[PDB]
Amino acid sequence: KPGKATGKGKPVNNKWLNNAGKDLGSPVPDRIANKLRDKEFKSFDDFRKKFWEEVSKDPELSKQFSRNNNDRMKVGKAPKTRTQDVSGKRTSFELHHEKPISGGVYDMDNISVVTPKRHIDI
Amino acid sequence: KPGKATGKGKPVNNKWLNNAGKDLGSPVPDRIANKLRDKEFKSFDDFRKKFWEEVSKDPELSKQFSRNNNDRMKVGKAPKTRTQDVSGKRTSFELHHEKPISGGVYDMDNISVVTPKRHIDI
Amino acid sequence: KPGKATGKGKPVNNKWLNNAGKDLGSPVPDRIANKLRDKEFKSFDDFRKKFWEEVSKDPELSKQFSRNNNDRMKVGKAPKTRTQDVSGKRTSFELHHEKPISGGVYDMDNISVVTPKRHIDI
Amino acid sequence: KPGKATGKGKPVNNKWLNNAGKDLGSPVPDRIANKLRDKEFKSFDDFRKKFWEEVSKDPELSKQFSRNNNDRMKVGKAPKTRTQDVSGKRTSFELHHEKPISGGVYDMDNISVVTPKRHIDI
Amino acid sequence: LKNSISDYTEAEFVQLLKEIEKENVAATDDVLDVLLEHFVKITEHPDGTDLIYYPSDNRDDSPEGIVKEIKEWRAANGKPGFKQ
Amino acid sequence: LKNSISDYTEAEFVQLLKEIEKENVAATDDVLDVLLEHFVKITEHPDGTDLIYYPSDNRDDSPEGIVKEIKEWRAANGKPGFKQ
Amino acid sequence: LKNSISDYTEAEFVQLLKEIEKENVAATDDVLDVLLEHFVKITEHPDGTDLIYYPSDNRDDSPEGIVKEIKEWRAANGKPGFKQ
Amino acid sequence: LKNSISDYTEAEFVQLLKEIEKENVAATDDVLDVLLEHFVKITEHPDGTDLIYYPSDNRDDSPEGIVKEIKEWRAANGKPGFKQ
Numbered sequence A, B, C, D: 001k002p003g004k005a006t007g008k009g010k011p012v013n014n015k016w017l018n019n020a021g022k023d024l025g026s027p028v029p030d031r032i033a034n035k036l037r038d039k040e041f042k043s044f045d046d047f048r049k050k051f052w053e054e055v056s057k058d059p060e061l062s063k064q065f066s067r068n069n070n071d072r073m074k075v076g077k078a079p080k081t082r083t084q085d086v087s088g089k090r091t092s093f094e095l096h097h098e099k100p101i102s103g104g105v106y107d108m109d110n111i112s113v114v115t116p117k118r119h120i121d122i
Numbered sequence E, F, G, H: 001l002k003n004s005i006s007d008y009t010e011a012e013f014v015q016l017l018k019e020i021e022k023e024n025v026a027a028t029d030d031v032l033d034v035l036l037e038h039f040v041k042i043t044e045h046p047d048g049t050d051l052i053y054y055p056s057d058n059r060d061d062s063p064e065g066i067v068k069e070i071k072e073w074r075a076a077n078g079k080p081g082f083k084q
């Protein structure tokens, strides 16, 4: 269901997703949270799309991805992960909620980016 | 500018456009007028698009065109004319107003279908 | 490996593949065998491609298929079977050898057309 | 008609085509001549295609073009010129023979690169 | 590739069918089969691809005929139709 | 887009026709008209696009019918046919 | 092919640019040149195709860079931007 | 879609890469993923799609760079190269 994005995220280095396959993965960049905060989305999917598009517009983050991955994010799709981090048909970075419905669907502080391999272990 | 379609058109045979390159060309089929009458359009172009789509839905008229021309009309485009009736870049049937702005833009009784060659002579 | 097509096939009705999902399936049409006989092919795959292209050229057989299936055969691909006769990723008619390598690879009299469902049972 | 490429061309700077719209235009790079020398081509068109492909492989020259122009040359097409140097449908760099048939068709020393505007003046 | 028949105008569904017709004549069925899976999923017709490859003799074997049969079936089963 | 009918196998010409069929249903004729100009140029048939939009009632209105008519006309006029 | 920049979302304009990139590597420029004419017409930028083939060194030579430059120029000249 | 790197000229492989780039920006990855599976199968490079999405900083992130890396790897491993 719809809702509004909230949270502050965290500052990230020039290797943002380097730890996406460990622990809870990589956090929502604070610069990205600033652009998405207080905005309404029809669903989490809508959020996910807007999220990646925002990443493509941030010079500090886009430079961390190849030209092909930047094009993917520019249209709202998650970037492809490295071959070693895929799992079956799941070949792109996924968003994981730390605290499930048991919540905070649009709580950027309860959202992170993880690889398929790591997500399955979680 | 926008407006509403009016008129009754005329009954046609199984050779509707056979005389599109003569005189004032072929008239708006009465069965087609019945479907477009009293409907509002943003522009004549909008009318032209809806016109051809209606022709593609009329079994008696669609059978008078080839499979490729039927596909054209199905998306609102005018059918291609015979090579002998073209004129430069104008290669499809055109709608001609008998009584210009000097009017009746959506007056189906003041509209007809003509070939490029004949339209230029007019 | 390469070889030459041999055999005479059998006469077929206007329902050639109606029994492709029963017993050994449908036989190679004799008119088709006449066109492929004594011709060399680099592999069975090459044969399969030429086979279907020949079927698309025979007016008596092409009329037994829809426009979309005719286009498939025209480029050497087997026609799609009915949804009820598919099995997983196998969704098109397959050629089956009655007498395996244990042979006659290009022996049109030892080749037939069968559906995926039936082929698996065989 | 076919023939073999001959010539030595000339050394060029990092602004090779900057003077393509003046005088006789830009010369054939000597590094490019070294790769094309003594090779046979079915026609000048074949030469033109191989020429541009060679340019795309030379790091010193490819860096002087944008990503879109590099892709063009990679498949044998001439790069697009600046809008200001085009002339009608001619929108890409052209090869000009200094000494016409009146010759040296594959003589790289008698060939140069010029813009449409300048070529017409010549 | 929308994930619902309601997102397609009749004209746009025809474009989808012509894309399938193009892949029909491609060297392989790799792309074709993905477009067909999508077609079957959004149409929800029990006969799936039969609408394309095994059209009823009671209607035209054309993009227009396919759309009409789908419209009639979805309407008769209380399912949302094409985007008006 | 080859610049000669001799460069096309019958299967490849069919692919060209399905590309034209796809552009037929596109929003505009910008691309379509370029493909048609190419079709008319390589076929060399006096009736040009009529082979596509105004097929003779003596043959099938299909990609296969178009290829057959072209083959028959080019052969009857001593012109090179499709690439075997 | 919409006939106005206002009909294109930034994502859709990127799709248009990738279609142009595909035709860039096609055998001929027949289709490419039509897409470029359309690009020049809707963008209304005086330098036309230079935005694609001769990008300023002050921005990225990418589909994203092209869109940003167009956005900045149209905004600075009081022209409608991409569809939000 | 040929089933062997030896069937592709360097120019044709570039066309394959631009087709993948087009699907990269499509609404979904349905078609994209099929083209990528094909890319991985014929290239036979252990890193598969990494050649496209995670290019080494020691070479250009471009269709031309991808082809060069593939050429060098297949040559170094005694595998047949692109069709000359």
Ligand SMILES: [Zn+2]
Pocket (backbone or CB within 6 Å): A095, A096, A097
């Ligand atoms: Zn999760």
Ligand SMILES: [Zn+2]
Pocket (backbone or CB within 6 Å): B095, B096, B097
């Ligand atoms: Zn008029």
Ligand SMILES: [Zn+2]
Pocket (backbone or CB within 6 Å): C095, C096, C097
């Ligand atoms: Zn078997």
Ligand SMILES: [Zn+2]
Pocket (backbone or CB within 6 Å): D095, D096, D097
């Ligand atoms: Zn000259």
